[PDB]
């Protein structure tokens, strides 16, 4: 169904999550210092449960307890500490984290509950659980898992790739699997020959997203999702948080909540450099502060740095700065008008961060690359959806290409303007 009315569609629930009273009576500080302890970061701004810290706080039925204190786990892992409540809430999640982080159970076991919340297979009903896994022996590892955790449950599950014969592959699907672990190729094929259907599908999954769209496979992806309802629960996990990833998941997920394990790496904020000439720039610079509904500005000069604070005060503008020739209680006190909201604008010549940034003007560009993206990481390490602003004036032309490196790498849009310098 391209466009669906869900309340034709059988009803089914996906919040199942009872709080265990030892993670209920942890305070918000303590939530914090155990988010921080294990490197979790929740975007926003989201609306997030308390993670869990043992596994019988997520209250899983005993059989899935019993293989679970079977393989003698002394703790779950970071990702799962944190998605077992989101997933077993029903909340559609973005999961950021690396391989070897424990995400297959993290997804699986609350995919079992979902499942076992509902009403047996009938003949010819399809998978209520989809996975979606770029290769096949990701595919396989997942299948193996699924299997260890819901032989005893009696759940059927099934591996659909490519490269293997369809027999058995049509008849474990003829047969019915409530969990189904499919690269798209292959499930594609079986779809449209209609060995097996997504009416039933409540529950899907998509594992390396990233992969999935680095090795081509998007559209495959988008032509199967658009059969399952859009009412569904949908898990995706990826090891990159860029553009690609970010649309395929407002694409497919409502309301959802993003949750990072792990160091930030690489974020995403827009980047935009504008080439003007050197006596433009005080212009555009005030245009570009008379649209504040903060402001870091950053030049190459402490003399200018000075300069341009004192005139940007004369103008009647609440600007700072802050330079290695002040003095360490100046520089405190700068900080700290800076943070409270009193100096919204910082002007500095450069470890330490501020948190709240909506915008970045390099009203000098660097003389380097380097000097350019830490100060992009810095600002964009934060959570916010803070604007880069760059003066660039076309006086350099190997300047000009390692700034379009730079902007090509981090998934930017540069303008026209600036191709058009080293297009001939
Ligand atoms: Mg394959």
């Given at each position: 169904?391209?466009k669906?009315?869900?309340?034709?569609?059988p009803?089914?629930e996906?919040?199942?999550?009872?709080?265990?009273?030892?993670?209920?009576?942890?305070?918000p500080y303590?939530?914090?210092?155990?988010?921080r302890?294990?490197?979790?970061?929740?975007?926003?701004?989201?609306?997030?449960?308390?993670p869990?810290?043992?596994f019988?706080?997520?209250?899983?039925?005993?059989?899935?307890?019993?293989?679970?204190?079977?393989?003698h786990?002394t703790?779950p892992?970071?990702?799962?500490?944190?998605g077992?409540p989101?997933a077993?809430?029903?909340?559609?999640?973005?999961?950021?984290?690396?391989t070897?982080?424990?995400?297959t159970?993290?997804?699986?076991?609350?995919?079992?509950?979902?499942?076992?919340h509902?009403?047996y297979?009938?003949?010819?009903?399809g998978?209520?659980?989809?996975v979606?896994?770029?290769?096949?022996?990701?595919?396989?590892?997942v299948?193996?898992?699924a299997?260890?955790?819901?032989?005893?449950?009696?759940?059927?599950?099934?591996?659909?790739?490519?490269?293997?014969?369809?027999g058995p592959?049509?008849?474990d699907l003829?047969?019915?699997?409530?969990?189904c672990?499919?690269?798209?190729?292959?499930?594609?094929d079986?779809?449209?020959?209609?060995?097996?259907?997504?009416?039933?599908?409540t529950?899907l999954?998509?594992d390396?997203?990233?992969?999935m769209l680095?090795?081509?496979?998007?559209?495959?992806?988008r032509?199967?999702?658009?059969?399952?309802?859009?009412?569904?629960?949908?898990?995706?996990?990826?090891?990159?948080?860029?553009?690609?990833?970010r649309?395929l998941?407002?694409?497919?997920?409502?309301?959802?909540?993003?949750?990072?394990?792990?160091?930030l790496?690489?974020?995403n904020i827009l980047?935009?450099?504008?080439?003007?000439?050197?006596?433009?720039?005080?212009?555009?610079?005030?245009?570009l502060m008379?649209?504040?509904?903060?402001?870091?500005?950053?030049?190459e000069?402490?003399?200018?740095?000075?300069?341009?604070?004192?005139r940007?005060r004369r103008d009647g503008w609440?600007?700072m700065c802050?330079?290695?020739?002040?003095?360490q209680?100046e520089?405190?006190?700068?900080?700290?008008?800076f943070?409270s909201?009193k100096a919204?604008?910082?002007?500095?010549?450069?470890?330490?961060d501020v948190?709240?940034?909506?915008?970045?003007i390099?009203?000098?560009?660097?003389?380097?690359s380097?000097?350019?993206?830490?100060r992009?990481?810095?600002?964009?390490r934060?959570?916010?959806?803070?604007t880069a602003?760059?003066?660039?004036?076309?006086?350099?032309?190997?300047?000009?290409?390692e700034?379009?490196?730079?902007?090509?790498?981090?998934?930017?849009?540069?303008?026209?303007k600036?191709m058009?310098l080293?297009?001939?």
């Amino acid at each position: 169904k391209k466009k669906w009315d869900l309340s034709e569609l059988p009803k089914f629930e996906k919040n199942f999550y009872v709080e265990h009273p030892e993670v209920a009576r942890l305070t918000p500080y303590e939530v914090d210092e155990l988010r921080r302890k294990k490197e979790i970061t929740v975007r926003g701004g989201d609306v997030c449960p308390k993670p869990v810290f043992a596994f019988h706080h997520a209250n899983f039925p005993q059989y899935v307890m019993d293989v679970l204190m079977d393989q003698h786990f002394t703790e779950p892992t970071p990702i799962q500490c944190q998605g077992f409540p989101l997933a077993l809430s029903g909340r559609d999640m973005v999961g950021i984290a690396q391989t070897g982080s424990g995400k297959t159970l993290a997804y699986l076991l609350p995919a079992i509950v979902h499942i076992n919340h509902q009403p047996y297979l009938e003949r010819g009903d399809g998978p209520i659980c989809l996975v979606l896994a770029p290769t096949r022996e990701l595919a396989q590892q997942v299948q193996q898992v699924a299997d260890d955790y819901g032989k005893c449950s009696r759940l059927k599950s099934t591996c659909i790739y490519g490269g293997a014969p369809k027999g058995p592959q049509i008849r474990d699907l003829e047969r019915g699997v409530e969990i189904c672990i499919a690269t798209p190729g292959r499930l594609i094929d079986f779809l449209e020959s209609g060995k097996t259907n997504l009416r039933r599908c409540t529950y899907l999954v998509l594992d390396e997203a990233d992969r999935m769209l680095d090795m081509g496979f998007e559209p495959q992806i988008r032509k199967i999702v658009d059969q399952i309802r859009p009412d569904r629960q949908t898990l995706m996990w990826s090891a990159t948080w860029p553009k690609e990833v970010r649309q395929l998941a407002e694409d497919f997920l409502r309301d959802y909540t993003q949750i990072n394990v792990g160091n930030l790496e690489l974020h995403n904020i827009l980047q935009i450099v504008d080439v003007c000439m050197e006596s433009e720039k005080d212009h555009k610079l005030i245009q570009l502060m008379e649209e504040i509904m903060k402001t870091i500005i950053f030049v190459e000069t402490k003399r200018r740095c000075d300069d341009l604070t004192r005139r940007m005060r004369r103008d009647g503008w609440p600007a700072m700065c802050i330079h290695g020739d002040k003095s360490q209680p100046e520089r405190d006190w700068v900080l700290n008008e800076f943070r409270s909201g009193k100096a919204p604008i910082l002007i500095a010549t450069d470890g330490l961060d501020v948190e709240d940034v909506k915008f970045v003007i390099n009203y000098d560009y660097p003389n380097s690359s380097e000097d350019y993206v830490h100060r992009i990481g810095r600002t964009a390490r934060s959570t916010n959806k803070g604007t880069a602003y760059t003066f660039f004036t076309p006086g350099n032309l190997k300047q000009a290409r390692e700034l379009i490196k730079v902007l090509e790498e981090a998934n930017q849009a540069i303008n026209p303007k600036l191709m058009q310098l080293v297009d001939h």
